[PDB]
């Protein structure tokens, strides 16, 4: 929903975005340009909704009045990343997006990268690789049917079969410097954006959540100076779009809640 | 529903007016009459209908705009 407005933006698997007016109960416009399913969408007070197309690995910002769109692409390569260092995983798809600002937004991908974007620059301004860590290594008792343990270990191929956690959820409180990310790692990580909006750091973690964080929301109450923030996250045993993820030990279906106070 | 957008808005005090390009989206509709567009533009700009003029409307091939 466009903030403080009746305009709704719907992303569809037919590679199109549909806009509705709930008060008039009517469809207004279809937006074209994505080459794969539009997985997630976010909006703020302005009509500038942003979207991510999953496997096409492109984030698009739509200027509905101007009838123009801005295309953002990651374009990162492990070869250069490793050489400059002298485990980096190539980006597969962008699954989540949230608008920090009318001129800034963040995205989360299946390689565990959390990227900060600016409308001025097509490339990311800052990236946080493997944000939620690496998946547990597969058990050697299950990889192979060999009796000898060393043979089973060789099938693990060292660290080559290790893959990162996906960013299943990503939410930024509007017009603030804090956003929350989620996965099935078992914790919600809270990040803080720099004052110049050129970087961010890990503020903390909330380990109560166990399972797949499908969606995150934040609500605040109290006086202007003194505000309590409640983080509500839907937790599930399976990913929202499909049943690919192997059953996570201890995962449960429920609503995760965390009330946070401000003092200083 | 019908959407009306104005773009390339120029304030022209030489002729005492505002000039713009009007894009009309009318899904599942043949087109929007000049009278109805004038009414809605008058509401949008907070001006009398008599002060609103619209012309030169060409429908896009395939319809809908």
């Amino acid at each position: 929903f466009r903030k403080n407005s009746d305009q709704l933006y719907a992303s569809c698997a037919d590679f199109k975005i549909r806009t509705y007016s709930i008060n008039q109960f009517s469809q207004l416009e279809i937006l074209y340009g994505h080459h794969d399913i539009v997985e997630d969408i976010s909006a703020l007070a302005m009509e500038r909704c942003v979207t991510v197309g999953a496997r096409d690995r492109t984030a698009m910002l739509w200027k509905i009045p101007d009838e123009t769109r801005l295309t953002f692409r990651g374009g990162d390569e492990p070869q250069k990343l490793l050489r400059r260092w002298m485990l980096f995983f190539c980006e597969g798809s962008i699954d989540v997006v949230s608008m920090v600002d009318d001129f800034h937004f963040i995205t989360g991908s299946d390689n565990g990268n959390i990227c900060l974007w600016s409308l001025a620059k097509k490339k990311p301004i800052f990236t946080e690789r493997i944000a939620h860590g690496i998946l547990p290594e597969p058990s050697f008792n299950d990889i192979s049917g060999e009796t000898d343990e060393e043979l089973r270990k060789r099938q693990l191929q060292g660290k080559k079969l290790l893959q990162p956690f996906w960013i299943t959820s990503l939410y930024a409180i509007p017009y603030s410097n804090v956003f929350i990310s989620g996965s099935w790692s078992g914790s919600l990580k809270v990040w803080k954006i720099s004052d110049n909006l050129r970087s961010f750091e890990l503020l903390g973690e909330l380990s109560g959540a166990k399972g797949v964080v499908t969606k995150i929301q934040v609500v605040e109450s109290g006086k202007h100076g003194k505000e309590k923030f409640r983080i509500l996250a839907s937790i599930a045993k399976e990913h929202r779009l499909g049943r690919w993820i192997a059953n996570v030990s201890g995962a449960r279906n429920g609503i995760y809640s965390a009330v946070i106070d401000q003092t200083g | 529903a019908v959407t009306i957008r104005t773009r390339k808005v120029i304030s022209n005090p030489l002729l005492a007016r505002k000039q713009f390009v009007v894009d009309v989206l009318h899904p599942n509709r043949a087109n929007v009459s000049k009278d109805e567009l004038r009414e809605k533009l008058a509401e949008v700009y907070k001006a009398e209908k008599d002060a609103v003029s619209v012309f030169g409307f060409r429908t896009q091939f395939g319809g809908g705009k």
Binding site: S26 | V2, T3, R7, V9, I10
Partner: peptide, 23 residues
């Protein structure tokens, strides 16, 4: 040693687009 008035500042346009929906 190398031997080598300002133009008027540009203005953001006064008017912007307006959008409405009906029916």
């Amino acid at each position: 040693f190398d031997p080598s008035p300002r133009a008027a500042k540009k203005r953001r346009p006064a008017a912007k687009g307006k959008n409405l929906s009906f029916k």
